[PDB]
Fold nitric oxide synthase, endothelial.
Amino acid sequence: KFPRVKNWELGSITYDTLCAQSQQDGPCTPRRCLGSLVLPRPAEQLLSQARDFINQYYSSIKRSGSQAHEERLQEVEAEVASTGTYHLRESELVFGAKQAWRNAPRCVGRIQWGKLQVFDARDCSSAQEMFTYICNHIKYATNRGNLRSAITVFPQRAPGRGDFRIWNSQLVRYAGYRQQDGSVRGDPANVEITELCIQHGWTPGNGRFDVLPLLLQAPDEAPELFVLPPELVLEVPLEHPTLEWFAALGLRWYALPAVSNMLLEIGGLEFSAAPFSGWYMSTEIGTRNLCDPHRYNILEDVAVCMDLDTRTTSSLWKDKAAVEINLAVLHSFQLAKVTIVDHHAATVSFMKHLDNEQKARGGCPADWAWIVPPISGSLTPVFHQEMVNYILSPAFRYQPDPW
Amino acid sequence: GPKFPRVKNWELGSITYDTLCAQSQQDGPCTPRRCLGSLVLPPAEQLLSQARDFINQYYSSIKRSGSQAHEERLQEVEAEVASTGTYHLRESELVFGAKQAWRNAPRCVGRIQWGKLQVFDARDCSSAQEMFTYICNHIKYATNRGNLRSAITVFPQRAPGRGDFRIWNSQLVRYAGYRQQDGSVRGDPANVEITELCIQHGWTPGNGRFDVLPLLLQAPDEAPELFVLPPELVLEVPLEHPTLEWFAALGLRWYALPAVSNMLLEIGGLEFSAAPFSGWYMSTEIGTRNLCDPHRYNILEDVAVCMDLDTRTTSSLWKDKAAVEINLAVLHSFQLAKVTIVDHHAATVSFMKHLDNEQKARGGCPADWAWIVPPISGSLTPVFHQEMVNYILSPAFRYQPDPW
Ligand code: HEM
Ligand code: HEM
Ligand SMILES: Fc1cccc([C@@H]2C[C@H]2CNCCc2ccnc(-n3ccnc3)n2)c1
Ligand SMILES: Fc1cccc([C@@H]2C[C@H]2CNCCc2ccnc(-n3ccnc3)n2)c1
Ligand SMILES: C[C@H](O)[C@H](O)[C@H]1CNc2nc(N)[nH]c(=O)c2N1
Ligand SMILES: C[C@H](O)[C@H](O)[C@H]1CNc2nc(N)[nH]c(=O)c2N1
Ligand SMILES: [Zn+2]
């Protein structure tokens, strides 16, 4: 019933009892484990999800069974009975957003979970207003390089009405231009979104690091294009502490990691546009974004500037170049006074979070394959830590692309 | 469309479906409620159905399903179980089964080599002394003066009303771990218990960082007997670095032959409690895990100090830098010494070729992503980007409790 979780570096053992509170099935069965997969393959339901969330909320403020708790359940029930849905109070919304971050099994930054600035954008009626809200989010979150975690929450989904959506997967993303020679200029992950922007009237550049406009969509309307004021998008030129030629590569990356295509679920309510941001863990940039074969793919270039032997895998040229690239990102961000956390510091804080959560809730949902960094896996403490994965609500969730 | 797990490669955008998992007869640890896949360790009628299933697998592999010889073997196996409670594998059945168990092992990245496995039948073994002889032969053959060859030696199966053949050591070759008076450990902390067991059984212990352990071998219903491997049979490689000249002065070394000796080999319901197998190392096994794990030799800080790195801050990436050079040293030294080894790049590439082979041959391949992805430079290898389905097929290798 209760999974036994072991750390193999320390020999310590916990028991996850929190998993029992999961109301949603993952993709695994006793026959086969599908844990390495990236994506998933009435009014009484909503009401039960609502009562549960409201119960969580009043529990969190040490007010269970109190009159305001009882009265709040009646409101929710009254509203659902009459309208098929209900609405959250701002304080409840704030609670729900923090819990969803807390419950996100793939996020290594969760030690920070209680410190989230929540912007209520539920009074938004147009793409233009979404743009204003997003611009303020970016300004606030970026804070001249001293990054602060934030989420802005747009109006919830409603029956038989189009969703508010941000079409971009992040608020800040570099264009990928499919050249005719089959190659890709810029970021290949973004070829499609780049093409949608062009179709909807965007004048493209021809750089490797052209910041994309946002396609914002108000319900049942064509999306609208919005260029971000370049002074809002903080960026960090990449150079290397000891290799002078590195800066010549023309490499750079943006400060603000803001996810804008995930769905936020709270108490049965769904928020289809609720962009959030924290700060980068350096491997996301140095390893995945810059070195993935299907991304900027710079490994061989850097390796050659380092005069390494590309001819054979056994010279570990890839491993060597990857380390210098990650060191460059960390150095550069530190020099530009922009918040960043290395994979060692991050995983150490995550272990502390696991311990905090073990005492607070009896467990912590974690996706080992995502928590372990893409380089130097076993060099970090989380590699040696068993982990249980499961879905708790409030939750962040993937959703289909609006097109 | 298809009612089977959809598996995606995110580097190449290609998709497959695993139909093979439908053949899984054993539940793993996961449920729809929670995934437990990161966990390291999470009656005649029964035997007969396992036996019938294996015999069917065997006759399929030789393309004789439905044949007279197929149906006679089924009747032959059921008769044996009916009168003895158990049965016995033909020689070629054992060879097939051993290979299929390796082919089926979700955690082994070396499975491209699965068809090339030398199977030594030792089911006639009747003493601990004889077990030692068979093991020495295995080591000699498998080591082959550095030109390593995959092999397994199969000792007699569990018999009802009789004690097991057991090799107490977790590997045929492992280094002693001596608990110190200050609480530290000299040698390999992984092997402290087995080391103390060897001493309790009369071994005269050394006091180096790399003393080869003797073997504790247990014949049925007898106390384990102790055997020292003649040093010339145990091939070792002193570790040096191709450019850092001081690395050789660290006096680090590792053994050539990676031989797992404590796992249970299950075929058709028959259980072989002693069936040691060996391949060749993937270099990260030694350079990253054995040498840099905090609870193993833990040499990262020592090497980083020699490299004059800033060990006072995480953001200098001193651990990453040191780990790279250690792995390079491992590869460089094995190659210099002409001892077979494979780096994590070549290994993972070959495993991808294996996935493609198995997709065509069986409609999938059970694989443990957390074990297949190497402990350094994960996303720089192609397997990181490959979704993987994990499930238990049989024949299988399984963990089994330590015999003490
Ligand atoms: C404060 C510093 C933060 C750090 C260092 C951090 C770190 C990370 C990292 C490295 C990932 C893996 C992403 C990937 O590799 O694609 C991740 C995932 C995730 N994080 Fe964070 N995060 C932070 C803040 C936040 C905040 C404020 C939220 C929400 C309010 C959040 C929610 C999530 C979610 C839902 C995922 C999974 C994304 C997906 O499945 O694509 N994180 N985090
Ligand atoms: C020929 C070259 C081989 C290579 C490069 C190789 C590689 C590996 C590696 C890297 C692991 C992970 C073990 C760990 O990290 O602790 C592993 C596990 C495993 N291998 Fe191999 N292997 C090879 C040959 C063999 C052979 C001949 C067999 C059996 C017939 C085998 C069966 C297994 C099994 C059962 C495991 C799981 C071990 C466990 O769970 O503790 N491998 N292999
Ligand atoms: F096609 C796809 C289907 C599912 C997921 C995919 C890639 C994994 C999703 C990216 N995951 C989040 C990436 C990201 C980017 C920027 N910031 C964060 N971030 C910020 C705070 N915490 C995480 N995360 C592609
Ligand atoms: F206490 C424990 C409980 C379960 C597993 C554990 C460690 C993971 C098992 C070691 N796994 C095998 C390591 C190994 C060593 C030498 N050779 C191989 N090998 C040889 C061919 N293929 C793999 N494997 C401890
Ligand atoms: C197939 C595999 O699950 C996929 O490559 C995962 C692995 N772990 C990851 N971990 C993080 N942090 N981010 C990712 O995108 C992925 N991708
Ligand atoms: C907790 C985690 O499951 C454990 O440390 C695993 C991770 N992946 C591994 N992968 C391999 N190849 N070998 C291992 O011993 C482990 N250990
Ligand atoms: Zn699972």
